[PDB]
Design a protein around this ligand. Sequence first.
Ligand SMILES: CC(=O)SCCNC(=O)CCNC(=O)[C@H](O)C(C)(C)COP(=O)(O)OP(=O)(O)OC[C@H]1O[C@@H](n2cnc3c(N)ncnc32)[C@H](O)[C@@H]1OP(=O)(O)O
Ligand SMILES: [Hg+2]
Ligand SMILES: [Hg+2]
Length: 355
Amino acid sequence: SMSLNDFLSSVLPVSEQFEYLSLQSIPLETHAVVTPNKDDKRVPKSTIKTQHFFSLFHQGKVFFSLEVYVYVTLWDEADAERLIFVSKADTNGYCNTRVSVRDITKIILEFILSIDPNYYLQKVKPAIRSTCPREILTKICLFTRPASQYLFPDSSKNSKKHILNGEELMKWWGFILDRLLIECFQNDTQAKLRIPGEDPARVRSYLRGMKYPLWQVGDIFTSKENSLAVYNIPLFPDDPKARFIHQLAEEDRLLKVSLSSFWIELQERQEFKLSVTSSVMGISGYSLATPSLFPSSADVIVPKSRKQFRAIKKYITGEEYDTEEGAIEAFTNIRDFLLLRMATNLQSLTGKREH
Ligand SMILES: CC(=O)SCCNC(=O)CCNC(=O)[C@H](O)C(C)(C)COP(=O)(O)OP(=O)(O)OC[C@H]1O[C@@H](n2cnc3c(N)ncnc32)[C@H](O)[C@@H]1OP(=O)(O)O
Ligand SMILES: [Hg+2]
Ligand SMILES: [Hg+2]
C-alpha cells in the first residue's frame, strides 16, 4: 500500500524537486448530503464530512491546487457509502518545469480512494460506530464547468496558464475518471456522464471512445427519471445542482419538479443556456482492492482547529496571482507557518516518471 508521497513522485517528472501540501480537516458530523424523504424506510444515521485540500509547489512557487470533499454516510448499523466529491482544481503556471496536471490529479484521487473509511470515523467526537470497508459503496461526483480561476485569484493573467474550454475540460476529467474506473473499480461499476447542453446521442457518441465498458449517459442519482429531484440530488458546496435546488425551494416547487424536468430546467439558469460547456460525471461502485490505508503524518497534516485549517488554506486561496510574487509568497507563508507553529516541513519528493 503506497503513500501519497509514493503516489505523487511516481507521476511527477524524473529527478526533479517538488514539495506538497496535504491539508485535511477534522471529520465532522453534519447534515444528510441528500435531503431525506419521510416516505423512505432508509434515512442516514450519520453523515461524516471532511475536506482534503492539496497543493503542489516547484522551487518555492505553488502552481496547482485540488479541493476534495469526502462524505461517509452510515445507514443501518451495517450499510455505508463514501462519496468523494471533487470541488475545485486550479493551476497558475508558475512552475519552471512541465508536469502532467492530468496525472497528478488522477493519482491524488487514487490516494483519497485508498483511504479506509474508518480513518474518518475514528476522529469524530464522540466515537462513531465503524463500518466494514470491504463492503462500503464508494461514489465520485464532479461537475465540469471551465473557468478563469478557482483557487488562485487573478492567475487568469499570467500569460502561460493553460485553461481548457468546456469540452476540452470535459474530455480531461473524462480521461481521469476512466483511468480510475479501469484500475480501481469492479467490472460492474456505474459510470455516468450527462451534459445538460443536450444532444443525448452526442454524449453517447463521445463515451464510445472510453476504455471502461460501462459508461452511459445519465447520472448516478437518477434511477427512475420520474422521482423528485429533492430526494435524489446531492447538495454539495458551491455546486450548481445545489444552487438550483435552493431556487426550487424559493418557488415552492420542490414537491413538484421531477429528476427528469430537473435536468431539462437546470440548463436555462444563466449558468448555461449555451454559455460554455458543462458536464456532470458520476461513479458508483465497489473498489477493486478494499481500502485500508490510514494516512500518516507524511501523507496528511490535520490542523486541530477549524480556524487553523482555514488559516493555512487562506494562504493559498487568498493571494494575488496576477504576478509570480503570489506563487512565491503562498509558498513562503505555508512553509513558514508549518515550521513555526506546527513544527512540520512540507513533505518533499524527487520525481521519478521518465519521459
Ligand atoms: C473539479 C472541477 O470540475 S473544476 C473545473 C476545471 N477547472 C478550471 O477550469 C479552472 C481553470 N483551469 C485550469 O486551471 C486548467 O485548465 C486545468 C488545471 C484544468 C488544466 O491544466 P493543464 O496544465 O492544462 O493540464 P495538463 O498539463 O494535464 O494538460 C495540458 C497539457 O496537455 C496537452 N494537451 C493539449 N491537448 C491535448 C489532448 N487532446 N490530449 C492530451 N493532451 C493534450 C498540452 O501539453 C497542454 O499543455 P499547455 O498548457 O502547454 O497547452
Ligand atoms: Hg509550468
Ligand atoms: Hg487502484
